């Protein structure tokens, strides 16, 4: 109902240092902005993740928005093997690249946003490590995580990856297995608030709160392709003044609807508010959730 | 089929005296050459054994790494006279022939090479036993028999073919028969120790055991489908090599593990590590195991 997860709330940006080329097609993210980044966010029987919280922000969004932090450098170069802070955290990590890509975006364990950069004409390979030569090359990057992020702003650093019956999984290491174990490659649920780690967890209790926020209605200007439009200049209710606006049931029962002197006709958003997580036992709201197919090593002896 | 195993432990000699027209593509065993005398090792529905154990050495590899030494004459000719001793064990012996080939090589009774050989131009008839005027031609031995073999120093010449109601099996004789007896061709394994005849098996106990050799592992880089990589380049614990290597925790159990100052990602080879035969209940280390399809002369009554 109502296929409008399109829309990007808020900001909406999907750029980063080095994809120069697609500068003036991913700022904003619109129904027509053929962001080569945004795109592959889209296609089914990829990301399910990112298609059941549609209505949200993506990695690149929450950097832009000053909620995630930058890498130093955020992009490495996987061409010559001199040396970059970016292969001993992805040689554990086991990811696909399609064809045509020069770079690949993940998230790191400092909490901060990582990538890599390949040198044109060069493109990637099939394990996401080094750089080969070359259909037409894309201008953008691919997430090699299915992560879903928004807005938050909840403290946490002081916390621990607490995974009973397992040493060394993923980045972190509590202790060594040296006799018996049990090593394979699956994917481990992990979750990084403000200014922390990448805390892994065990089980996935997640639970959106549905609420009248500004973030939960997608807006697009109305006209006699639809181009989306500000959501922070609609009234409140009772209120006829400022930018008028006009919506569904749901914008008419939470703003003002002035129909003929409004602009840009808004919408609801399938499925969108507070998202929650439960983490040590207590209820805490997260930043960026998702999964990782990286090693893990479980205790046997 | 299966490029992956084309690589040969140790020097990877597959000819011999007098058939060297391929020694370009046979020396070394490339990809893009057509090595007549490995081909046929790799086809399924022939010799399965052969592919259960890819990475090992076979007949002519251990003759070019002094291991079995070369008969007398080593290339006994098919234009017999009434005579040639090269003719009465091939007699014995039911093999099939795919034509084109113009030699065969198969293991003698005293435990040495003895291979046939045509002249040019002939070609190998459908019972093996004659050379006769001449799709193309093949310029490589047809291996006889399914066998394999390997580097070891285990003394076992005090060991002789032991079984129970066989009279002559093959070429040899155990017991004296003079009553009934069946003559058929049946499949019979065979051992031969570290100076010792060729003797037959009854129950055949094989134990697959990994060892930390070059041989036993393949390296494939991505820089530039993969290609090969060649091992030899990589650096050794305690010295220093022409370029860098690393892999999982079997690689850097025998080299050194470099991680991002690397080009390769080596691997392991499935199907290597030295073999062990059960002879009478303790464990001893042969030297080449095969079967092959000979007369046998049971006991009836």
């Given at each position: 109902e109502d296929p409008h997860l399109r829309?990007?709330?808020?900001?909406?940006h999907n750029y980063i240092d080095g994809m120069t080329q697609e500068d003036a097609t991913c700022k904003p993210v619109t129904y027509?902005?053929?962001?080569?980044?945004?795109?592959?966010?889209?296609?089914?029987?990829?990301?399910?993740?990112?298609?059941?919280?549609?209505h949200h922000r993506?990695?690149?969004?929450?950097?832009?928005?000053?909620?995630?932090?930058?890498?130093?450098?955020?992009?490495?170069?996987?061409?010559?093997?001199?040396?970059?802070?970016?292969?001993?955290?992805?040689?554990?990590?086991?990811?696909?690249?399609?064809n045509d890509y020069?770079?690949?975006?993940?998230?790191?364990?400092?909490?901060?946003?990582?990538?890599?950069?390949?040198p044109p004409k060069y493109e990637l390979t099939e394990d996401c490590n080094f750089c080969r030569q070359m259909a037409s090359l894309k201008k953008g990057s691919y997430p090699l995580q299915d992560l879903f992020c928004q807005s938050s702003e909840d403290d946490g650093s002081?916390?621990?990856?607490?995974?009973?019956?397992?040493?060394?999984?993923?980045?972190?290491?509590?202790?060594?297995?040296?006799?018996q174990l049990s090593t394979a490659h699956?994917?481990?649920p992990f979750a990084v608030f403000k200014n922390s780690k990448k805390v892994y967890l065990d089980?996935?209790?997640l639970k959106t709160e549905e609420n009248?926020?500004?973030?939960?209605?997608?807006?697009?200007?109305?006209?006699?392709?639809?181009?989306?439009f500000d959501i922070s200049q609609c009234p409140k209710i009772g209120g006829h003044g400022s930018k008028k606006c006009t919506g569904d049931a749901a914008f008419c029962s939470a703003y003002e609807c002035t129909a003929q002197y409004a602009n840009a006709y808004c919408s609801h958003a399938n499925g969108s508010g507070i998202v929650q997580i439960q983490v040590s036992g207590v209820w805490k709201k997260p930043l960026c959730v998702g999964y990782e197919r990286v090693v893990v090593k479980r205790e046997l002896s």
């Open positions: 829309n990007r709330p808020g900001k909406g027509a902005g053929a962001c080569s980044s945004f795109d592959v966010l889209l296609e089914k029987g990829k990301f399910p993740l990112f298609q059941s919280y549609a993506t990695l690149l969004e929450a950097v832009h928005d000053t909620i995630i932090a930058k890498a130093d450098p955020p992009s490495c170069d996987l061409q010559s093997a001199h040396g970059n802070p970016c292969m001993k955290e992805k040689l554990v990590m086991k990811t696909h690249c399609p020069q770079s690949a975006h993940y998230l790191n364990n400092d909490g901060k946003m990582a990538s890599v950069k390949c002081k916390l621990k990856t607490k995974m009973k019956g397992v040493c060394e999984v993923g980045v972190q290491a509590l202790k060594k297995c040296d006799g699956e994917v481990v089980k996935l209790d009248l926020l500004p973030d939960s209605f997608v807006c697009f200007e109305h006209k006699g392709e639809l181009k989306s």
